[PDB]
């Protein structure tokens, strides 16, 4: 708490005259070893199970009839 309070207090807040403006115009950490279980190679069957068809777009280029109708129509003829 004390350390981060000091940091934030510094953040918010040869002789140098106050009038001058600023003068200059305005590898990561070493890679950690990959510690993994040995990979299981893909079977051809299940590799076939993830095959994705291409997208054929309708836009981009690059009836069951209920029997009561019979009844109704029949009644009207009568």
């Amino acid at each position: 708490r004390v350390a981060l309070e000091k940091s934030v207090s510094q953040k918010v807040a040869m002789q140098k005259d106050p009038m001058e403006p600023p003068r200059f115009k305005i590898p990561p950490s070493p890679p950690a070893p990959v510690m993994h279980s040995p990979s299981r190679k893909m079977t051809v069957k299940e590799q076939q199970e993830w095959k994705i068809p291409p997208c054929i777009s309708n836009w981009k280029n690059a009836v069951h009839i209920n029997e009561n109708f019979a009844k109704l129509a029949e009644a009207l003829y009568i």
Partner: protein, 500 residues
Amino acid sequence: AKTVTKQRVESHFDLELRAAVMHDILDMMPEGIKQNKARTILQHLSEAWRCWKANIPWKVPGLPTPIENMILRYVKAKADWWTNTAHYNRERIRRGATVDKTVCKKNLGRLTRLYLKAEQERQHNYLKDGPYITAEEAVAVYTTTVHWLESRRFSPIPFPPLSYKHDTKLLILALERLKEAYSVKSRLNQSQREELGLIEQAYDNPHEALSRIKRHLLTQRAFKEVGIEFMDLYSHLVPVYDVEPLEKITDAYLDQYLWYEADKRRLFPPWIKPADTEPPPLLVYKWCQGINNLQDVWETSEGECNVMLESRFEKMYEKIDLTLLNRLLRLIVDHNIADYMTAKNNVVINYKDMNHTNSYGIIRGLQFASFIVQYYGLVMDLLVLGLHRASEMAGPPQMPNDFLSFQDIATEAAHPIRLFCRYIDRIHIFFRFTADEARDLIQRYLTEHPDPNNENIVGYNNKKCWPRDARMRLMKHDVNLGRAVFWDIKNRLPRSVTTV
């Protein structure tokens, strides 16, 4: 960092849905997969959404079911986001909160697509779930109309002969309506220039045009598709139908002819409004005069009551059945014309990428649709009245009554319904009950709908425009009399044809 502002809202939604779908693709695909094929899965997502908007069924035959389940999940999420936004931007448009015109255009577009998804479902359910009008209700409606037309001694309209003495006058009227629609505009569509071309060609030689119309009415039974748009009136939307020009000239001629012969032969009894003789404020004036001149109308010393209910025939256009409409039009016109009208309602409707067949209701944007509504509304009037009271109202066919008047004073007092008017969908009825008739009704109503807590005052709605002295006083007797009258009228009408 930039915020998400109104410019950036939709693109940010797509940007985030895209990223989340990509994450689930990575966690879903098995270890050591030969290919990622992520871009193709996102193409299937786009095609699924585009098929949702067009109401076109989406199936991809090869596709694995983890991928398809993920796609159906995220398309449903986007559909909910789309539809809720449609829902509250319509509220803002109606209340006046938006002033931007592009948001009104976008909401109109979204609203149209949602309407057509619903309407296409309604047509499908009509064919699968049977006609809603039962054989019994249909035969009762048909037989009642036959007795009405038989007692009024109506002579049915014939097919117009080609040597018909009035047909160029009817043609000239029809072409003036059609030409008036294009009066002012400049640089019209291709179809509108086609339509003006046909109108001028029918001015040149009318006999050719009349021959074509008669041949269409005799033989054409399979028609072109109509387009649909919506007129945004900011508080609701109105359907606007686009019919091909050739067909439109034939319909306009039939429309003029049918109204002329029906007016000459006295098909529509005088309660059916708007009438040609009066503007609507004269109708309002006539009603006041009509009410004031009923016998003993304002006397309440013995406990009589007057009831005036104004309501609408809800969804009357949509619930018309085209089979029964054909059989009912055949009572009034040459069966060839009846086949033409009923077959003309059976068209494909198409806005943008979506289209469906209309098979249930009428298309209100046909030229002769007004005739159909009035004539079909006449049948509904005979349900609300009786044949007996309607015969008293229309008078004997030799000497027919005029609007809101009776042959006698005893005739007007014989029944509770004293005045009736049907302005298209809307109806206005005036009842005069004695205390015995009112007590009878309230007891039947309270038998069916018992109210121990007396909550009937809660639902009742009255005119907040007038001051408190002028509004309806919601007294117990009067609230139950009003609900009983409404309930009785509502029981008159089968739910499959229309309701109140």
